[PDB]
Structure formats: C-alpha cells, structure tokens
Paper text:
The YTH (YT521-B homology) domain-containing proteins are a family of RNA-binding proteins that specifically recognize N 6-methyladenosine (m6A), the most abundant internal modification in eukaryotic RNA. In contrast, the DF proteins (DF1, [name], and DF3) are mainly cytoplasmic and play essential roles in mRNA translation, stability, and degradation. Our study focuses on [name], which is involved in multiple types of cancer, including prostate cancer, MYC-driven breast cancer, and acute myeloid leukemia (AML). We have also presented the crystal structures of [name] in complex with six ligands, which represent six distinct chemotypes (compounds 3–6, 13, and 15).
The X-ray crystal structure was solved for compounds 3–6 at high resolution. In our first screening campaign, we described a series of uracil analogues; compound 4 is a new member of this series with a modest IC50 value of 250 μM. The six binders 1–6 belong to four distinct chemotypes: thiobarbiturates (1–3), uracil, nicotinamide, and pyrazolopyrimidine. Despite their chemical diversity, these chemotypes feature an NH group that is involved as a hydrogen-bond donor with the backbone carbonyl of C433. Furthermore, they act as hydrogen-bond acceptor of the conserved water that forms hydrogen bonds with the side chains of W432 and D528. Notably, compounds 1–3 occupy the bottom of the aromatic cage with their sulfur atom, while compounds 4–6 have a methyl group as in the natural ligand. Compounds 1–4 and 6 act as hydrogen-bond acceptors for the backbone NH of Y418, and they also form a hydrogen bond with the side chain of D422. This interaction may offer selectivity against the nuclear reader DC1, which features the N367 hydrogen-bond donor NH2 in this position.
Numbering used by the authors: 400 to 548
C-alpha cells in the first residue's frame, strides 16, 4: 500500500494551464513561473496565508496537449516588478520561484475521472488556469501522478 498522501491536512493545490511549451521549458530550467495578473494574485494570496505550514502545489498542463506535464511547488511570493518579455506573452508582469517536483507526462485519461466540486463537478482535466483543487481531490491526483509509468 501507499498511504503517503492520505495523511496530510494542510496544503493547497492549483492547476496551471500554459499555452507555451517554451514557458514550461524555461520554468523547469530556471525554477520560476508567472501567471496572469489575476492568476498571480490568487497564487500569491495562497502562498502568503500558508505561512510555510504546508506546500502550495502547481499541477502543470499545456493547453491542448491532452496530458499533465509535471508538478512543482511554489517557493516564493510574487514579485510584480521584474524584467518584462521573458515569457511567451511579452506583457506578463511578475515572477515567483518554484521548485519542480515531478517532470513526466501523465495522460488526461489517468485523471479525467477526478471531478472538482468547486468547479461544477467538471473533470480536473477540464480546468482553467489557476483553478484551485480541493485538498481531498488533490491527494487523489498526486497519487496517480506519482505512480504512473
């Protein structure tokens, strides 16, 4: 048995949807990310209120790819005044640190049965960028990602 993810009552988990394979590569290389203005605010608020008592996990997926491409932990608050033009969208304003945990493709078929009660019971695979995942469903997603081969 694998009971690791069942025993943890803190932590928050968000879906990250990227249009750009380049941005994913840059994020893995440099352990940084940036979302939209409203996405950055949502993640910043979550990281800050955690105050280090548990992780903020990011579940990454490229729009249209049909799979998740990995998992990272948020590792800093959002710095909103950084060098412009480092990403796909040249307007994107800001940067936060991440630490990539798992880099592997996980097909949407492995995950489409998990549904989000905070997003109209839609499959977790049909989420938009910075959709939060309820912790009890996030445990199920993380276990599937960690045991897929």
């Amino acid at each position: 048995e694998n009971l690791y993810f069942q025993h943890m009552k803190h932590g928050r988990v968000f879906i990250i949807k990227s249009y750009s394979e380049d941005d994913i590569h840059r994020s893995i290389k440099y352990n940084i990310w940036c979302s939209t203005e409203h996405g950055n605010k949502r993640l910043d608020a979550a990281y800050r209120s955690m105050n280090g008592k548990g992780p903020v996990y990011l579940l990454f997926s490229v729009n249209g790819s049909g799979h998740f491409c990995g998992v990272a932990e948020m590792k800093s608050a959002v710095d909103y005044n950084t060098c412009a033009g480092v990403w796909s969208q040249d307007k994107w304003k800001g940067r936060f640190d991440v630490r990539w945990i798992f880099v592997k493709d996980v097909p949407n078929s492995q995950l489409r049965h998990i549904r989000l009660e905070n997003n109209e019971n839609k499959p977790v695979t049909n989420s938009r960028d910075t959709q939060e995942v309820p912790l009890e469903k996030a445990k199920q997603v993380l276990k599937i990602i960690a045991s897929y081969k």
